[PDB]
Amino acid sequence: YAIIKTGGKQIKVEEGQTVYIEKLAAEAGETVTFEDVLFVGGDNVKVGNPTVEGATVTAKVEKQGRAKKITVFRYKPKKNVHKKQGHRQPYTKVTIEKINA
Amino acid sequence: TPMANASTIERKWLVVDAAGKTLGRLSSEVAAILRGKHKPTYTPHVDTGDHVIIINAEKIELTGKKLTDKIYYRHTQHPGGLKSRTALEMRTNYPEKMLELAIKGMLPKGSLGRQMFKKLNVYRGSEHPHEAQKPEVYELRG
Amino acid sequence: AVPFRRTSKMKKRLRRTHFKLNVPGMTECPSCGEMKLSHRVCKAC
Amino acid sequence: NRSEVRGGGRKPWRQKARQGSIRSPQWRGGGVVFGPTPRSYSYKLPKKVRRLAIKSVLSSKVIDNNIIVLEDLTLDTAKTKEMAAILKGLSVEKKALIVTADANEAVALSARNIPGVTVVEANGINVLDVVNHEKLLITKAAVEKVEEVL
Amino acid sequence: QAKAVARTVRIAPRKARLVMDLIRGKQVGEAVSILNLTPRAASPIIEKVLKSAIANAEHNYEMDANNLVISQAFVDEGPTLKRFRPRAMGRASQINKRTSHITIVVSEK
Amino acid sequence: MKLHELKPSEGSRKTRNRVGRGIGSGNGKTAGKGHKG
Amino acid sequence: PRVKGGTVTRKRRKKVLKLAKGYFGSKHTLYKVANQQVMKSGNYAFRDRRQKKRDFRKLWITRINAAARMNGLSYSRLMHGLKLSGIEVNRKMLADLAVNDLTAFNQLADAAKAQLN
RNA sequence: GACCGAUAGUGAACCAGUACCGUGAGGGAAAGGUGAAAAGCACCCCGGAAGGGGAGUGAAAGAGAUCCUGAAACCGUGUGCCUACAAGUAGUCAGAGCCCGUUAACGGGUGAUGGCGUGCCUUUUGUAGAAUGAACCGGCGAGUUACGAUCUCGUGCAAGGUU
RNA sequence: UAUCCUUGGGAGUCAGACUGCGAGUGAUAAGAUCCGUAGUCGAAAGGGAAACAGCCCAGACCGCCAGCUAAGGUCCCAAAG
RNA sequence: AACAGUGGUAGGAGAGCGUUCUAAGGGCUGUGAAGCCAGACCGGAAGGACUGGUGGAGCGCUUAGAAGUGAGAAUGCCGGU
RNA sequence: ACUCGGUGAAAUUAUAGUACCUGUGAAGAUGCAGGUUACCCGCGACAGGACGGAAAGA
Structure with a gap:
């Protein structure tokens, strides 16, 4: 299991599990690859300076979606200030493949 | 994905000997143990602490002149009904309550704090009846 | 002596919890099968 | 109005204060604040604008091939059946406008009952009945009259 | 299962529910005795409705009078009559004469 | 110009400003007249 | 012409009353109080979507402190050592997982110890 | 009739200047809808009756006489989850357990515990206040029109334009 | 560095409050007394000062269970010696 | 595309959502219209669909036009509770 | 008055799961901060608070 950094954030992944990333472009069916692997734990552990040199985690794209809607509502008492807005944050569903080379 | 703990909590029993120790310096560490701050699986709402037995409660130490000028008050409910007694009387006659007041x-x-306090046992003397729980010996870090 | 505020439903229902009736004390008449209050009369029973 | 509703003079209240009128606009009784009022909606355009508009509509209908120029439209008998046969002969299946020179009566009586046909004379044509009706039937004399008027 | 309803009965619903709570769930034969021996003014009315329900169960659905139990029993609100001037003797105003709908259902256990 | 495809000349018609119909339009409570003035 | 209007009012109030589902007593029944509660909930939700990011970091720091003191260090010394070794890229969140699920992360504490000398 | 459609439109769609109020001059309401057709429930059963349950008529009887549709407040019956050591503008974020299974969606219901959190409106330099208003629900309830003045935009024609 | 001039249309506003500097003022230290002069609130949420319109840091388009700091802090409540 | 920006009361400016009616084109609907009830759907907001129940005869889409044009506060008025 | 059977109103009412103390605060804190107490639900009394009404100085 490695520790990737994708969306200005880090995740811990093991082969076969499904993860949700930030948009991450790409298209359903494509095979994405991550370069910044910061730690490869397991039997042999490879703590790496900045990033473990020569470490890549492949993965497969399943869908590009948007999460459940959030209704952002704010107001100020006594001042007649209202503001309503909707938000659905895009994501990407990805399945982890071979967590080395 | 962070692991919150529930029904997986496993507690231990520790014995702390309060012979040559200061009231506040011991109580801080003991309360931290009771709340579970020393465990990697600590979660803020499920009380992951463990049990603490304190012996030799009558040997606690107070620096300065606290043994004469530290007063313990209590107001029962009646208006103006405020009674008190000095720390010397508290340590000579009710040591256990004196330790419990600080640790509490x-x-x-709240509810979780009261449960955490329920996890504490204080005994004057040198013997405790909890040999069936096979407690260990814990040394204060500082 | 003026109600400062209206009473909520839950408090009304809570106050009305002791305001209920009791099952009577009834025995069956030796002759017949009529039911009467205990220690009451029913030869016609 | 709040003053044209029956009653309302006295201040409704008394005692054993007195404020308002049972006919104020916020009462169930009556009193409408502004509401509609009888007025005319008509106005006028410059004459050159009217001439340009009618000419534009006529030319537009010319472009779409929705114009049929008939030598003459005469009816020996004033029968609705004969107008229906004539209209079918020219392949006019929808709303149509017929323009005659000086309002002959046999054509006016026929096609009066046909649900999509309107008959006018040369000096009666205007923007609405030209735009509205899909097709335009006009006699050669009415063409001359319209051309010489404009 | 059999049902019997009494509509617009001249009784306040809150006072009828006191007895309705007593009798619901009981065996149908025992319930009649409780109604006969309770000293309330809703008992006679509820007893009439219960007897009517038992009758329908035998004459219309051919179920036996034994092996019968009270399944549902509730009281609803009926149209209210408003007496605006109890000025007669009373110094009150707009008295409300309330009303009830009494329903009883029985079935075989 | 068909009667179901009428288009005004661009810029000849402006929508009237209706005052006093909510705080989201900017002309709500005080109706554009502000406070006492 | 005249315009009556009842349907728009009913629908607009029903939306709010449906959003107020689950509140206590009158606050899921009457429109006037349900509206106030829904507005308050919107404000609270914004504020707490910020406070959540505030709070999970606090939890992570607490767990790291515990697991580090299980090794002879404190949180501050361990973080300084980790940053001084470039391995600090590793987060606090990921560190905390590797504290409840693999205390063999002590490897990282050993690296920080080596760099702190 | 780019007029209303039963709180509207006449005060009055209904035995309305009626009922009511006042000594009198005078003031002045509320109240429309079975069904295509009464075919408007023979007969049986409980009940003094009222009212029901069958049977029957009917497309419909949950269309049975204030009988089209029938919302909300308000009042009840049953049940899934929680609740008798707990201090609260009642929610919000984190969160086990239990119960479900959807417009399949990083699902629905309830929530033991932890953090944060002094209603809405008006007004004021400033409000959580011992400033003000609202018992709750529903309906109705406020920047128009005419004639002048002026400015911008559009269209037509232009030293001319218009009745 | 990107503002400022003219013309035209539309306005709102006319009891402001507190804090810090001065040393104009009892020119001195003032307090006064106003005078200036700057800031904040009004119209500004967020962190700190236990709580706190006007003090300190700092100006919220919206999401994230990412990182670095400001004022202020690191025995426990309560994050960190 | 590359930068820069997006707190806000009085107030100024801009873009839109819904309601009734009218005109033109297109349609729905007794194999079930409007209205009412429920739902875990869609849009940046005002809002809009789709399924199921009830209902038992009318309604909506596109482009224009006209307004008795949108309610939580008036010790509002009327009704119900 | 109280218990039982019958009948049955009014002023008031933003919603409300509505402790106490010491502070803070635009008037006086239940609802702000810190602490201390408190199993759930009633019936009868008191008049302390009642931001109840009377009052009235002024």
Whole structure:
């Protein structure tokens, strides 16, 4: 299991599990690859300076979606200030493949 | 994905000997143990602490002149009904309550804090009846 | 002596919890099968 | 109005204060604040604008091939059946406008009952009945009259 | 299962529910005795409705009078009559004469 | 110009400003007249 | 012409009353109080979507402190050592997982110890 | 009739200047809808009756006489989850357990515990206040029109334009 | 560095409050007394000062269970010696 | 595309959502219209669909036009509770 | 008055799961901060608070 950094954030992944990333472009069916692997734990552990040199985690794209809607509502008492807005944050569903080379 | 703990909590029993120790310096560490701050699986709402037995409660130490000028008050409910007694009387006659008052005051307020306090046992003397729980010996860090 | 505020439903229902009736004390008449209050009369029973 | 509703003079209240009128606009009784009022909606355009508009509509209908120029439209008998046969002969299946020179009566009586046909004379044509009706039937004399008027 | 309803009965619903709570769930034969021996003014009315329900169960659905139990029993609100001037003797105003709908259902256990 | 495809000349018609119909339009409570003035 | 209007009012109030589902007593029944509660909930939700990011970091720091003191260090010394070794890229969140699920992360504490000398 | 459609439109769609109020001059309401057709429930059963349950008529009887549709407040019956050591503008974020299974969606219901959190409106330099208003629900309830003045935009024609 | 001039249309506003500097003022230290002069609130949420319109840091388009700091802090409540 | 920006009361400016009616084109609907009830759907907001129940005869889409044009506060008025 | 059977109103009412103390605060804190107490639900009394009404100085 490695520790990737994708969306200005880090995740811990093991082969076969499904993860949700930030948009991450790409298209359903494509095979994405991550370069910044910061730690490869397991039997042999490879703590790496900045990033473990020569470490890549492949993965497969399943869908590009948007999460459940959030209704952002704010107001100020006594001042007649209202503001309503909707938000659905895009994501990407990805399945982890071979967590080395 | 962070692991919150529930029904997986496993507690231990520790014995702390309060012979040559200061009231506040011991109570802080004991309350931290009771709240579970020393465990990697600590979660803020499920009380992951463990049990603490304190012996030799009558040997606690107070620096300065606290043994004469530290007063313990209590107001029952009646208006103006405020009674008091000095720390010398408290340590000579009610040591256990004196330790409990400090440790309770260092604990969070609410239901979880009261449960955490329920996890504490204080005994004057040198013997405790909890040999069936096979407790260990814990040394204060500082 | 003026109600400062209206009473909520839950408090009304809570106050009305002791305002209920009791099952009577009834025995069956030796002759017949009529039911009467205990220690009451029913030869016609 | 709040003053044209029956009653309302006295201040409704008394005692054993007195404020308002049972006919104020916020009462169930009556009193409408502004509401509609009888007025005319008509106005006028410059004459050159009217001439340009009618000419534009006529030319537009010319472009779409929705114009049929008939030598003459005469009816020996004033029968609705004969107008229906004539209209079918020219392949006019929808709303149509017929323009005659000086309002002959046999054509006016026929096609009066046909649900999509309107008959006018040369000096009666205007923007609405030209735009509205899909097709335009006009006699050669009415063409001359319209051309010489404009 | 059999049902019997009494509509617009001249009784306040809150006072009828006191007895309705007593009798619901009981065996149908025992319930009649409780109604006969309770000293309330809703008992006679509820007893009439219960007897009517038992009758329908035998004459219309051919179920036996034994092996019968009270399944549902509730009281609803009926149209209210408003007496605006109890000025007669009373110094009150707009008295409300309330009303009830009494329903009883029985079935075989 | 068909009667179901009428288009005004661009810029000849402006929508009237209706005052006093909510705080989201900017002309709500005080109706554009502000406070006492 | 005249315009009556009842349907728009009913629908607009029903939306709010449906959003107020689950509140206590009158606050899921009457429109006037349900509206106030829904507005308050919107404000609270914004504020707490910020406070959540505030709070999970606090939890992570607490767990790291505990697991580090299980090794002879404190949180501050361990973080300084980790940053001084470039391995600090590793987060606090990921560190905390590797504290409840693999205390063999002590490897990282050993690296920080080596760099702190 | 780019007029209303039963709180509207006449005060009055209904035995309305009626009922009511006042000594009198005078003031002045509320109240429309079975069904295509009464075919408007023979007969049986409980009940003094009222009212029901069958049977029957009917497309419909949950269309049975204030009988089209029938919302909300308000009042009840049953049940899934929680609740008798707990201090609260009642939610919000984190969160086990239990119960479900959807417009399949990083699902629905309830929530033991932890953090944060002094209603809405008006007004004021400033409000959580011992400033003000609202018992709750529903309906109705406020920047128009005419004639002048002026400015911008559009269209037509232009030293001319218009009745 | 990107503002400022003219013309035209539309306005709102006319009891402001507190804090710090001065040393104009009892020119001195003032307090006064106003005078200036700057800031904040009004119209500004967020962190700190236990709580706190006007003090300190700092100006919220919206999401994230990412990182670095400001004022202020690191025995326990309560994050960190 | 590359930068820069997006707190806000009085107030100024801009873009839109819904309601009734009218005109033109297109349609729905007794194999079930409007209205009412429920739902875990869609849009940046005002809002809009789709399924199921009830209902038992009318309604909506596109482009224009006209307004008795949108309610939580008036010790509002009327009704119900 | 109280218990039982019958009948049955009014002023008031933003919603409300509505402790106490010491502070803070635009008037006086239940609802702000810190602490201390408190199993759930009633019936009868008191008059302390009642931001109840009377009052009235002024």
